[PDB]
Amino acid sequence: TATSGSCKGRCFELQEVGPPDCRCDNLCKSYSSCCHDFDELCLKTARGWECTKDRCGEVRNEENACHCSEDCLSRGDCCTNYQVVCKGESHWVDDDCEEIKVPECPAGFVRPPLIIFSVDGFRASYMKKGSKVMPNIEKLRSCGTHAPYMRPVYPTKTFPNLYTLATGLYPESHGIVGNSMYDPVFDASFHLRGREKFNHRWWGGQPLWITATKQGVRAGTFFWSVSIPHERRILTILQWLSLPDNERPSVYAFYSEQPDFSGHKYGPFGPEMTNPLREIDKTVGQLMDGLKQLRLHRCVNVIFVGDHGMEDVTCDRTEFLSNYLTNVDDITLVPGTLGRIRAKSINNSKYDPKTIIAALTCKKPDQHFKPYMKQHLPKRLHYANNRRIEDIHLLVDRRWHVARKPLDVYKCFFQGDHGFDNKVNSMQTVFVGYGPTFKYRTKVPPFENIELYNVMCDLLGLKPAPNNGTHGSLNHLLRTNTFRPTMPDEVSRPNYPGIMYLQSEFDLGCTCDDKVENKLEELNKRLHTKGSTKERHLLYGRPAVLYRTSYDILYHTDFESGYSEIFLMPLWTSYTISKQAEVSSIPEHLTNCVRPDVRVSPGFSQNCLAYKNDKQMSYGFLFPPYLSSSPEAKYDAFLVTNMVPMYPAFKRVWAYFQRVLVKKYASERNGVNVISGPIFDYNYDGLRDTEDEIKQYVEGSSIPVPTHYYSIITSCLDFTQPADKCDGPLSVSSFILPHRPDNDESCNSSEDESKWVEELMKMHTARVRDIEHLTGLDFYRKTSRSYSEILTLKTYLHTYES
């Protein structure tokens, strides 16, 4: 760096200059490459940040941090309180809220600017609890559009979340999978301290600033050097906004290190937290007074957003791997509010992950972490498909830490931390949108930060890069510039087989003990098999298969299914259980009954003999025999086309769901509609496997083994209407349960299922959209609701927090 070129005329230049020409953009500080006079010219502080009566009308003096002279507004560099102090205008916070129906912008603005105001560690409940000391923020919140909270991504750390906001991507796709990382392809490490984090190969996807630039829209800086004071960041944004039309950016970011920085020292609600909240609110007032001075306060869209919350954690709530493993120096742990384990050295072939897992599993009765192979983590976390994520993972209980040994923690500092499971209440953060493009005085439901990239693109007239948002699911935040998606086109149309095979054509090894014989009830069973009850059981139309495959629709009195001829089982099975329905047992004449389905050939069917031979694998049913409507209909549940492969350990789970919980939910929700099926994700990418990806079959057959079993449980949001006769919006909960040959995940599993199955199921709660990615199906195709509303429903996650 030839650091005696000047920064005069160039302070906070938007375009970078190449070495050895010295840099005046921020970042120069983080690369130790600013011109000599950067601090003198670009970080002025003389006289501070506010006009006072004496300074009014002063003679411009270029030394001052900001100006109170007559020319300041045309120059764009007044102190933010200049009109208040010198011109008897009011602060923005003191003005009544007035609806912003249309952008009210100076001439030459082609679109409303967007300012992203990101606040580190701003936990959701600060909006209520800190309301009395945050008047600027409360005005934004109550006059704009807000959610009660915003769900971050896992892990609930800073870079992963801010880079998710910027990209629309899950950490596993963008690459920033933690605040610290090892990449084995690069054989390189990423850390908070230092300079390797600045290398571009860490940062995948396409962040907003590049999407903007590629499409002709200019962007301010996103990263601010920590030494640049907040008042200077604000003033710099206001200055940029005064630029001429061909130079002026349309998108800006402000970042605050608070309240996170104090939160770590004092805890989320320590009495010392009041002042950091006051100071953030002041900064917001500065921006808004600044915008008002420039006539931009009814022209800009402002997004007030956090990265994550903050929880109470102290040194004494640390679990030590040294209390579990005697081999502790054979491993490297990424420690803290999550754990990631790999081998200390890759030439130590002694190392065995399964013995590590086994040594970490349910060893102390209150153990405050749980070990997982990463493919076995809750699919809702989307935290597996990246080489930077170690195969072994520890999910840590809220309020706790994990470390390798006690010398790591005592060689106490802190009272707050974050990083936990992203459904945890303390990790939730905030969203407020304010401006012409946002709605007025509107509350919207909680949503995930992965959704914002699409909105930010909508706000700016950009086409979003491919991302994990569901574009349109946040249209209800927006006054206009909505994105109007169409439903994906069905790729494969189903077959509707009739009766084509005789009983004796099947050699299955299946006994069913069922021979016992009317003409009233013959046309009656015929019409059920042709789809007469189908409107009762298929409430929202059939799911659409979005890939090329061969399948059949099979109708029955109590349930309807799309049966895959390639996978030899259903892709989905749909049934409705009313509030009035009764549970019955499986009779004795039918316990090991499996019956041929005479609509589907022997060659596209499963067989019992494969199950008998497979000593690890048994079978269950997608439509549960327990809930059949009549003894005649119960025969249908024993069709071989309703059977699926299940480990006996998983059958404990599945039986309890089918026998107890479904009926419970129908009572609580006034009927439910259920869609259940299998999921195959052997490469843990969150997407449906092709047949050639499947790693496990039922011994000696072509029957593929699911990695997971899903269910989607839909009812009427107004629960006074029964599920099958609902006029308005819907209510959904779903899960994606791991199909595991043991219940090691559930420490209490030796007890009766009412003590542990429901807990397992809540941990594996899912969005409908997660199931779609995993199955290639598109649900809710025929409802009376608008498509955007259905998109919102598909992104809903039932979290089971209070």
Ligand X SMILES: *[C@@H]1O[C@H](CO)[C@@H](O[C@@H]2O[C@H](CO)[C@@H](O[C@@H]3O[C@H](CO[C@H]4O[C@H](CO)[C@@H](O)[C@H](O[C@H]5O[C@H](CO)[C@@H](O)[C@H](O)[C@@H]5O[C@H]5O[C@H](CO)[C@@H](O)[C@H](O)[C@@H]5O)[C@@H]4O)[C@@H](O)[C@H](O[C@H]4O[C@H](CO)[C@@H](O)[C@H](O)[C@@H]4O[C@H]4O[C@H](CO)[C@@H](O)[C@H](O)[C@@H]4O)[C@@H]3O)[C@H](O)[C@H]2NC(C)=O)[C@H](O)[C@H]1NC(C)=O
Ligand Y SMILES: Cn1c(C#N)cnc1COc1cc(Cl)c(C#N)cc1C(C)(C)C
Which residues are the active-site residues?
A: 158
Positions 325 through 354 that interact with ligand Y (CB under 6 A): none
Beta strand pairing call for 145-151 and 442-443? parallel
Tokens of 127: 């909006």
Contacts of 535 (CB under 8 A, 6+ apart): none
User: Which span sits near ligand X by CB under 6 A: 99-107, 380-388, 556-564, 713-721?
Assistant: 380-388
Task: Closer to Ca ion by CB, 431 or 780: give it.
Answer: 431
Q: Which helix (H) or strand (E) holds 169?
A: none
Give the per-residue contact string, 584-623, with Zn ion (x = CB under 5 A; - = no): ----------------------------------------
Q: What number of residues does the chain have? A: 802
Integer angstrom CA distances of residue 390 from 329, 381, 683 = 17, 15, 15
What Rg value do the Cα atoms of the chain yield, rounded? 30
Give the per-residue contact string, 381-420, with ligand X (x = CB under 6 A; - = no): -x--xx----------------------------------
Binding to Ca ion by residue 257, rule CB under 5 A? Answer: no
- Answer with the entry of Zn ion, ligand Y, Na ion, none that 796 interacts with (C-beta below 5 to 8 A by kind): none
Binding to Cl ion by residue 179, rule CB under 5 A? Answer: yes
* Residue 580 burial class via C-beta count within 10 angstroms: exposed 0-12, middle 13-18, buried 19 and up: exposed
DSSP secondary structure string for all residues of 653-718? HHHHIIIIIHHHHHHHHTSEEEEEEEE--TT-SSSPPPGGG---BSTTSS-BPPSEEEEEEEEESS
User: Which span sits near ligand Y by CB under 6 A: 99-107, 161-169, 504-512, 605-613?
Assistant: 161-169
Q: Is 153 helix (H, G, I), strand (E, B) or coil?
A: coil
Q: Is 126 helix (H, G, I), strand (E, B) or coil?
A: helix
Give the per-residue contact string, 186-205, with ligand X (x = CB under 6 A; - = no): ------------------xx
Q: What is the DSSP letter of 198?
A: G
CA angle, residues 699, 704, 707, in degrees to nearest 5: 110
Contact residue for ligand X among 256, 468, 734, 743 (CB under 6 A): 468
* Residue 74 burial class via C-beta count within 10 angstroms: exposed 0-12, middle 13-18, buried 19 and up: exposed
User: Which span sits near Zn ion by CB under 5 A: 70-78, 223-231, 242-250, 258-266?
Assistant: 258-266
Kindly state the smallest distance separating residue 615's Cβ from Na ion, in Å: 6
Is 230 annotated in some ligand binding site?
Answer: no
Is 136 annotated in some ligand binding site?
Answer: no
Q: Which helix (H) or strand (E) holds 772?
A: helix 768-775
Integer angstrom CA distances of residue 778 from 636, 700, 771, 790, 791 = 26, 33, 9, 11, 11
User: Which span sits near Cl ion by CB under 5 A: 178-186, 193-201, 587-595, 651-659?
Assistant: 178-186
Contact residue for ligand Y among 223, 501, 719, 787 (CB under 6 A): 223
Contact residue for Na ion among 743, 765, 775, 788 (CB under 5 A): 743
Kindly state the smallest distance separating residue 240's Cβ from Ca ion, in Å: 25
β-bridge partners, 146: 432, 443
Positions 115 through 144 that interact with ligand Y (CB under 6 A): 116, 118
Is 179 annotated in some ligand binding site?
Answer: yes
Binding to Zn ion by residue 260, rule CB under 5 A? Answer: yes
Task: Closer to Cl ion by CB, 369 or 434: give it.
Answer: 369
- Answer with the entry of ligand X, ligand Y, Ca ion, none that 385 interacts with (C-beta below 5 to 8 A by kind): ligand X
Binding to ligand X by residue 174, rule CB under 6 A? Answer: yes
Is 264 annotated in some ligand binding site?
Answer: yes
Q: Is residue 259 reached through a cis peptide bond, with omega within 30 degrees of 0 on the bond before it? A: yes
Q: Is residue 155 reached through a cis peptide bond, with omega within 30 degrees of 0 on the bond before it? A: yes
Contact residue for ligand Y among 49, 255, 266, 483 (CB under 6 A): 255
Kindly state the smallest distance separating residue 641's Cβ from ligand X, in Å: 29
Tokens of 286: 């500065």
Q: Which helix (H) or strand (E) holds 258?
A: strand 251-259
User: Which span sits near Cl ion by CB under 5 A: 132-140, 176-184, 295-303, 491-499?
Assistant: 176-184
To the nearest 10°, report the CA torsion of 683, 385, 428, 116: -130
Positions 649 through 708 that interact with ligand X (CB under 6 A): 686-687
Cα–Cα dist 360/369, whole Å: 9
Is 458 annotated in some ligand binding site?
Answer: no
Binding to Na ion by residue 749, rule CB under 5 A? Answer: yes
Cα–Cα dist 739/253, whole Å: 44
Contact residue for ligand X among 113, 175, 306, 671 (CB under 6 A): 175
Binding to ligand Y by residue 217, rule CB under 6 A? Answer: no
- Answer with the entry of Cl ion, ligand X, Ca ion, none that 179 interacts with (C-beta below 5 to 8 A by kind): Cl ion
Cα–Cα dist 458/451, whole Å: 11
Binding to ligand Y by residue 253, rule CB under 6 A? Answer: yes
Q: What is the DSSP letter of 503?
A: G
Kindly state the smallest distance separating residue 267's Cβ from Zn ion, in Å: 12
Is 246 annotated in some ligand binding site?
Answer: no
Interface residues with ligand Y (CB under 6 A) are 116, 118, 158-159, 162-163, 165-166, 222-224, 253, 255
Q: Could you tell me which residues are annotated as the binding site?
A: 120, 158, 179, 260, 264, 307-308, 418, 681, 683, 685, 687, 689
Interface residues with Na ion (CB under 5 A) are 611, 614, 618, 743, 746, 749
Interface residues with ligand X (CB under 6 A) are 169-170, 172-175, 204-205, 382, 385-386, 466-468, 686-687, 773
